Design a protein around this ligand. Structure first.
Ligand SMILES: Nc1ncnc2c1ncn2[C@@H]1O[C@H](COP(=O)(O)OP(=O)(O)O)[C@@H](O)[C@H]1O
Ligand SMILES: Nc1ncnc2c1ncn2[C@@H]1O[C@H](COP(=O)(O)OP(=O)(O)O)[C@@H](O)[C@H]1O
Ligand SMILES: Nc1ncnc2c1ncn2[C@@H]1O[C@H](COP(=O)(O)OP(=O)(O)O)[C@@H](O)[C@H]1O
Ligand SMILES: [Mg+2]
Ligand SMILES: [Mg+2]
Ligand SMILES: [Mg+2]
Lengths: 72, 372, 7, 372, 372, 7, 7
């Protein structure tokens, strides 16, 4: 999930919808611990040690980007 | 509490919503696209198939298929994709929680209802459902218990006479003319003027041309005489690439094939003669009350002037001493949905649903005895 | 359809 | 950890580096020189052949050969010398440790890819590699998933339309005009003014003249009228021996042959008409989105005013009602490398590489099915 | 006495002659060349443009233009040059003395017929003329009153079903695939093997390669498996400069795009599926009699094995219990001419001509009502 | 043609 | 190349 997120940061015209689509592609049916929420195409569920937690994609690309220009 | 879903599968537009709201909150074309070009860029999120407005947006790179033709579902996996997309994406409602109400044209195969019911119970696990006749719902929508409904969508046209809520099943007429084959006729006549629309996307462009520029002539011969003798009738339309195309007598000449199906090469009479020949199958005591109500439904009845042409030539066919009145409310494109929204919210209707208990007991065969 | 028309 | 090498063979400049850094740290001409004069001094360390900047420094005494002509590798032993020089001398990296990513123009022979792969696996023993289309990488470099890329290096020019990451392979246009034959045209037009540049070193001098003093006229006839009637347009350049040479209308007149290939005697239309005739091969629904992005790439698109000339005459050809937009970032000379540097660093791409296991199983034939 | 001229404009070959002789005595390509190089020698008799076999002989120095593209005449002055050359040079007959019979593909613009008639009456002053459908003439040529004609020239392909002399105009299918775009596909696939054919003369060389070495595979996958696994299928051809070129799977792979138009990137089905989908538009009582006659016409149907491939996959699509019969006479390249030669010599036909009296009275508009 | 195709 | 052009 972090690897596909760091890919989608540099990918051209990356967005939270296409990142989510890459998530569903890679892990929707290959892993028991990753699940898609029934009614939404913008969120995903991870079964952690404690509990299942549902994450919204809508923030992550803005929050994940750092790049600092040396001139600044 | 719990409110039925109301869904009309049509051809072209799907329109769906909740019972007792006044217009459908999901409307989109019943179209499935699959990409046909070799994908080059790695890591694009490229997708196996698109549904509805997605497949309209990307239609340049897609083969577009309609899973319903003449009200018959030809391709079932794509129809399951369209319902899956409708419930989860468009309405965002889980189908286990809601009875579902589904709409069909008359005189079409039984297997279509058996499969629609097997799918709604087995895959969606819908708790209860019903299958309703398109024409019957237009009376609920127009506030009447009597009339001969004329309905035309994409695909099938049908007449259904109803008198005080009794259908007259020996008098039901069905015709495959309407709506899509008008577009395949417009594409053929436009070639005469030097425009060529072959691909499934160009068919959607011609559909938009038809919806904007076509109208029905009061007299087809007088207007062909006028349009041969002038430029006054001629309109121009701007293609999505910014080309501009100019359209002459073709725009009235396309919907005239509703009244003269021999243009496309059918052997049956126009909608006015199937309407009159449907009233002639009703017993003489009720004909007075059918001539006083004719209800138009579905998008192919939206052409400007189609009501006054219908009334004119039915008034030519009918006996001289009677009111002929054509009823064509401006909202009529949604009338079958509004009528199903009314029907599904009645309290008397809550005993009509097929419940999963009954489907489990009797199998999908039950639909024929319980439904119409 | 199954016989007459194409669908 | 391990980072792919990214190499673009071009014609003229080699440019190479590591994936995920932002500009190539090796850039040098793809040129091989062999000494042609009788060597006199004993004990000089004289050497059989020179590569890259060595052969530029000594070019007075060398015959200079280009091993790549019109994107086709004509001479393989010199190409192996250029790769050996790139990996060992320029990057100082052992190729066994790094996947390598290699770039090629579309529509060139398959034997070129088969040999490039056979060499990279057998002699270098590179663990994994891939062969990428030059034009596709300029979209990665310009941050887009849609557009018609126009690319011109030395040698081949090609157009490749792409829409949301799908190529349209029937619409790919390729033209052999660009870059070297502009130099062989400049050498021919300079003779009218009394300058003679015959040797392969003098061709490199004329290449430097072309890169400094040439520019594209907005209107070719107005500027020929001006330059016939004035000295105002005239610039002078200092040869390596300190002679000074003066260049008039020739400097704009040389790159006009990109838009009028009949000057050199080709029978095909200019890059603007191959761009328009490439958009005309795309289906009408997407053309609006190709006119809204045109991406220039490669050094032959660096002439001053080539963007505004392209936009002017494409806006002449296109339908009147559309935005034509030419995108020409100042960095565009490196765009194919920057795009391959982005591509090779994606995580989704790590399954795309041809691995030596697969080459051993299937032989070099595999490249056609696995690569584009 | 007086005998009608019969002329079929096609694309590529013009073929023309007198009614009631059995083969055309003028045949030549419908091509116009204009010289593009600076003429040097004074006093050479150098000429502004060349037509037909002249432009084939000198094609090294000429730009070659086709004035007809996809059965539409795009350039009218060159078409007038081709007719002037046909009547005066090839037939050496003054057109005022003879009715003229002219041939056209179905479903093409009306302006093409209006201009053809305005030119034949006003400039040539032909006393009477007629415009005939290409497909209809192949039945006259093959001795039948019933069948679904499949016709492919250069440019347009079309199917026209006819039953006892009645056309079925709603079932006419037209496809732009045939013949020229096979050559533009062959030029693209030959580049894969390292041969480059760009100029309009090199296109004529590739057309001759296609006419000699191409053939249709019975099974396309088995033969690609064979040609990947052997040299046995491989043929070599000698270019006009005495180079020799070697052609492998490309030779069967080029005409397979007739059955899989997605290769060139069309969205429509192959000629076999447009034939079957044309028979499906005919009423069920006549289909038995269309399956029992399929008539191939025009030069693009000359490939070896195209009949047995057509019969094989149509026999795959059709219901199992019927004769499928493909009729493909060895003369079929001339069938449209032979059929027009028969038609123009009937006595019943002498009332069909448009006479100049009628053109003077009604103007060129008459062609639509009098002709088909 | 005048729209769809090039002729 | 091998036919049309020199490379
Ligand atoms: N305003 C209009 N004028 C003419 N045709 C229309 C108009 N609106 C829709 N149509 C055509 O009518 C058909 C859609 O009718 P609709 O009732 O939505 O079909 P269905 O009943 O199958 O859902 C389409 O073929 C569409 O092109
Ligand atoms: N600033 C410039 N102005 C005009 N032409 C240039 C400029 N820089 C390089 N060129 C020309 O462009 C070609 C090099 O382009 P490049 O993209 O390096 O080729 P390749 O893509 O084959 O590596 C050479 O012919 C060179 O003369
Ligand atoms: N023996 C052949 N095999 C394959 N293709 C052929 C042969 N002869 C002609 N052709 C092709 O068919 C086309 C000519 O067909 P023709 O019937 O003369 O066209 P039209 O009907 O337009 O006059 C050209 O594209 C030509 O290359
Ligand atoms: Mg409806
Ligand atoms: Mg480059
Ligand atoms: Mg022909």
């Amino acid at each position: 999930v972090l690897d596909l997120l760091d890919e989608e940061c540099k990918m051209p015209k990356g967005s939270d919808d296409t990142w989510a689509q890459k998530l569903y592609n890679t892990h929707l049916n290959k892993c028991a611990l990753f699940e898609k929420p029934r009614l939404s195409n913008k969120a995903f569920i991870i079964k952690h040690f404690a509990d299942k937690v549902e994450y919204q994609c809508e923030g992550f690309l803005e929050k994940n980007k750092d790049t600092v220009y040396e001139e600044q | 509490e719990t409110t039925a879903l109301v869904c009309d599968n049509g051809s072209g537009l799907v329109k769906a919503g909740f019972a007792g709201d006044d217009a459908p909150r999901a409307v989109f074309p019943s179209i499935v696209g699959r990409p046909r070009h070799q994908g080059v860029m790695v890591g694009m999120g490229q997708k196996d198939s698109y549904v509805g407005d997605e497949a309209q947006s990307k239609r340049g790179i897609l083969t577009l298929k309609y899973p319903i033709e003449h009200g018959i579902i030809t391709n079932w996996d794509d129809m399951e994709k369209i319902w899956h997309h409708t419930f989860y994406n468009e309405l965002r409602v889980a189908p286990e929680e809601h009875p579902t109400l589904l709409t069909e044209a008359p005189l079409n195969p039984k297997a279509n209802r058996e499969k629609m019911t097997q799918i709604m119970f087995e895959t969606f696990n819908v708790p209860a459902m019903y299958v309703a006749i398109q024409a019957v719902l237009s009376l609920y929508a127009s506030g009447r218990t009597t009339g001969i409904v004329l309905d035309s969508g994409d695909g099938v046209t049908h007449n259904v006479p109803i008198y005080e809520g009794y259908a007259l099943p020996h008098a039901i007429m069905r015709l495959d003319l309407a709506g899509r084959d008008l577009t395949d006729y417009l594409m053929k006549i436009l070639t005469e003027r030097g425009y060529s629309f072959v691909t499934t996307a160009e068919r959607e462009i011609v559909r938009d041309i038809k919806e904007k520029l076509c109208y029905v002539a009061l007299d087809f011969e007088n207007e062909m005489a006028t349009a041969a003798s002038s430029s006054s009738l001629e309109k121009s339309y701007e293609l999505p690439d910014g080309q501009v195309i100019t359209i002459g007598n073709e725009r009235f000449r396309c919907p005239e094939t509703l009244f003269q199906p021999s243009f496309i090469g059918m052997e049956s009479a126009g909608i006015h003669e199937t309407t009159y020949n449907s009233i002639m199958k009703c017993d003489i005591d009720i004909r007075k009350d059918l001539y006083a109500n004719n209800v138009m439904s579905g998008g192919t009845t939206m052409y400007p002037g189609i009501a006054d042409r219908m009334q004119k030539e039915i008034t030519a066919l009918a006996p001289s001493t009677m009111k002929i009145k054509i009823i064509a409310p401006p909202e009529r494109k949604y009338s079958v949905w509004i009528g199903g929204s009314i029907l599904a919210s009645l309290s008397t209707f809550q005993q009509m649903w097929i419940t999963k208990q009954e489907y489990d007991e009797a199998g999908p065969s039950i639909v024929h005895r319980k439904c119409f | 359809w199954x016989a007459x028309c194409p669908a």
